[PDB]
Scaffold this active site. Sequence first.
Site, PDB file in Angstrom:
ATOM      1  N   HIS A  12       0.679  -1.398  -0.042  1.00 19.49           N
ATOM      2  CA  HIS A  12       0.238   0.116   0.175  1.00 19.49           C
ATOM      3  C   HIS A  12       0.831   1.455  -0.003  1.00 19.49           C
ATOM      4  O   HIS A  12       0.159   2.508  -0.376  1.00 19.49           O
ATOM      5  CB  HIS A  12      -1.092   0.026   1.231  1.00 19.49           C
ATOM      6  CG  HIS A  12      -2.103  -0.996   1.164  1.00 19.49           C
ATOM      7  ND1 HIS A  12      -2.862  -1.240   0.315  1.00 19.49           N
ATOM      8  CD2 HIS A  12      -2.143  -2.127   1.870  1.00 19.49           C
ATOM      9  CE1 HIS A  12      -3.480  -2.350   0.545  1.00 19.49           C
ATOM     10  NE2 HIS A  12      -3.009  -3.069   1.476  1.00 19.49           N
ATOM     11  N   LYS A  41      -4.627  -9.657  -8.209  1.00 15.96           N
ATOM     12  CA  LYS A  41      -5.522  -8.992  -7.571  1.00 15.96           C
ATOM     13  C   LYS A  41      -6.532  -8.222  -7.834  1.00 15.96           C
ATOM     14  O   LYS A  41      -6.079  -7.456  -8.765  1.00 15.96           O
ATOM     15  CB  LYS A  41      -4.630  -8.104  -6.285  1.00 15.96           C
ATOM     16  CG  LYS A  41      -4.015  -9.041  -5.354  1.00 15.96           C
ATOM     17  CD  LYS A  41      -3.203  -8.148  -4.154  1.00 15.96           C
ATOM     18  CE  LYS A  41      -2.774  -8.567  -2.929  1.00 15.96           C
ATOM     19  NZ  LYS A  41      -1.624  -9.817  -3.767  1.00 15.96           N
ATOM     20  N   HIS A 119      -3.772  -3.791   7.742  1.00 11.97           N
ATOM     21  CA  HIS A 119      -4.699  -3.785   6.729  1.00 11.97           C
ATOM     22  C   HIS A 119      -5.308  -2.394   6.210  1.00 11.97           C
ATOM     23  O   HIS A 119      -5.604  -1.689   7.196  1.00 11.97           O
ATOM     24  CB  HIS A 119      -5.645  -4.647   7.388  1.00 11.97           C
ATOM     25  CG  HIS A 119      -7.304  -4.667   6.650  1.00 11.97           C
ATOM     26  ND1 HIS A 119      -7.511  -5.371   5.708  1.00 11.97           N
ATOM     27  CD2 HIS A 119      -8.431  -4.191   6.946  1.00 11.97           C
ATOM     28  CE1 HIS A 119      -8.727  -5.262   5.262  1.00 11.97           C
ATOM     29  NE2 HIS A 119      -9.300  -4.407   5.936  1.00 11.97           N
ATOM     30  N   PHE A 120      -5.820  -2.340   4.822  1.00 15.77           N
ATOM     31  CA  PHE A 120      -6.217  -1.191   4.327  1.00 15.77           C
ATOM     32  C   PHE A 120      -7.718  -1.633   4.128  1.00 15.77           C
ATOM     33  O   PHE A 120      -8.040  -2.487   3.399  1.00 15.77           O
ATOM     34  CB  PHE A 120      -5.514  -0.813   2.924  1.00 15.77           C
ATOM     35  CG  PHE A 120      -6.082   0.534   2.324  1.00 15.77           C
ATOM     36  CD1 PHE A 120      -7.150   0.593   1.646  1.00 15.77           C
ATOM     37  CD2 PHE A 120      -5.423   1.631   2.794  1.00 15.77           C
ATOM     38  CE1 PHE A 120      -7.598   1.903   1.468  1.00 15.77           C
ATOM     39  CE2 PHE A 120      -5.750   2.857   2.151  1.00 15.77           C
ATOM     40  CZ  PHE A 120      -7.009   2.904   1.549  1.00 15.77           C
ATOM     41  N   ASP A 121      -8.527  -0.889   5.038  1.00 19.87           N
ATOM     42  CA  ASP A 121     -10.079  -1.247   4.827  1.00 19.87           C
ATOM     43  C   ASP A 121     -10.866  -0.696   3.649  1.00 19.87           C
ATOM     44  O   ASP A 121     -11.622  -0.969   3.137  1.00 19.87           O
ATOM     45  CB  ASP A 121     -10.586  -1.189   6.246  1.00 19.87           C
ATOM     46  CG  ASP A 121     -11.865  -1.854   6.459  1.00 19.87           C
ATOM     47  OD1 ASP A 121     -11.916  -3.014   6.145  1.00 19.87           O
ATOM     48  OD2 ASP A 121     -12.960  -1.352   6.913  1.00 19.87           O
TER      49      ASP A 121
END
EC number: 4.6.1.18
Length: 124
Positions: A12, A41, A119-121
């Site tokens: 990210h 992805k 984590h990128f939500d």
Amino acid sequence: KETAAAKFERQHMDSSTSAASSSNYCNQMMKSRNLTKDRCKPVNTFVHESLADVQAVCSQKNVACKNGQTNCYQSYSTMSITDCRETGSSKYPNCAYKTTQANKHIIVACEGNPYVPVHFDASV
């Protein structure tokens, strides 16, 4: 093994540019960060800010994650981000993406000591 925190950085973070500079940004970055090794992805987001500023989000506004967990945090400020979404012509191993620039708040999940993004939500 790669830690979750290191994986977040790889997946990210892109502090080396201020914004995506061409339509090919996502194609090049998804490949270079090894995000397409086993499968394409479908979506990803890159954040064009310093690592320290992103890590600091873990001390900002606590919110529910999309899946209901409560270790998510929303940034107080908007950030420069790039959205990458698979196109209709993508076919492994030649994964292909549409690059979209945005300026949005980010929501990340944090864990650990030191307490860092894992984590990128979402972006909002």
